[PDB]
């Protein structure tokens, strides 16, 4: 959920609620356990609030309307500062990066995807070293992605 | 640390001032991470005005920000 129907899909002043309220009501009952989710929930604070979709949602929070969001910690901070309300509905769930060894475990799970994606074999030691490499040389990136970048980049390198 | 302090540590930008990255380094870390341990490196050279305002956390473990929000993470550990 969001950005497309909630923003691109708007020409009129009530378009923050048209379609949006519609779908909120469409999903309240009968049609299995519908859960919407927001990948870029930062928008849902509103630019100056003004109920830019953001208030109608929590306004209806007494039931159903199950939604999971996602924000970075600083975006969280910003939507909190810029709203004060969605936070009463939303549970803050902290996500920590994995250790290097744990990162390798995901790399292993992902390894065959990459071998397939690029048509190349990958060594287990590739994954192991990618993760420790990243810890050492990529301070501005988190391990999951950093290690994967080393893998997917290397694979792409070879693919070319 | 200089007398500007605010953002680089615990207070953050007074809301309404440009820079909405506020207390990123310390307060927001506690905001995000209920509590942890903090280490105050060479407090002798910290700006005096700052040493003074950090007292709000040293005892009466309050953490009021420029965001207008308060963390109060008295559950943390501080080492100076």
């Amino acid at each position: 959920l969001d950005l497309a129907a909630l923003t691109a899909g708007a020409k009129y002043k009530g378009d923050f609620e048209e379609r949006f309220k519609g779908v909120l009501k469409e999903i309240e009952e009968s049609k299995t356990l519908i859960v919407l989710f927001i990948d870029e929930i930062h928008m849902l604070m509103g630019n100056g609030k003004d109920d830019a979709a953001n208030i109608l949602k929590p306004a209806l929070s007494r039931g159903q309307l199950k939604v999971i969001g996602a924000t970075t910690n600083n975006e969280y901070r910003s939507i909190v500062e810029k709203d004060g309300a969605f936070e009463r509905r939303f549970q803050k769930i902290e996500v920590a990066e994995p250790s290097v060894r744990q990162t390798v475990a995901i790399l292993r799970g992902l390894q065959p995807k990459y071998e397939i994606h690029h048509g190349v074999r990958i060594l287990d030691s590739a994954l192991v070293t990618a993760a420790q490499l990243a810890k050492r040389y990529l301070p501005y990136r988190r391990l999951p992605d950093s290690a994967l970048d080393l893998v997917d980049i290397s694979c792409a390198g070879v693919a070319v | 640390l200089s007398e500007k302090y605010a953002v680089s540590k615990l207070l953050g930008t007074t809301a309404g001032y440009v820079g909405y990255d506020e207390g990123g380094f310390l307060t927001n870390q506690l905001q995000y991470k209920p509590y942890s341990v903090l280490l105050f490196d060479e407090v002798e050279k910290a700006h005096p005005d700052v040493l003074t305002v950090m007292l709000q956390m040293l005892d009466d473990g309050r953490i009021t920000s420029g965001q207008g929000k308060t963390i109060d993470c008295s559950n943390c550990i501080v080492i100076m």
Binding site: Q91, K92, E94 | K33, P34, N75
Partner: peptide, 28 residues
Amino acid sequence: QNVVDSDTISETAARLTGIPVKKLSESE
């Protein structure tokens, strides 16, 4: 599983609020 004052509140709260100080673990 009668909701437990201690173990349930502490554990579920800890998963969301951290608070390891409230765990009272057997690994003390």
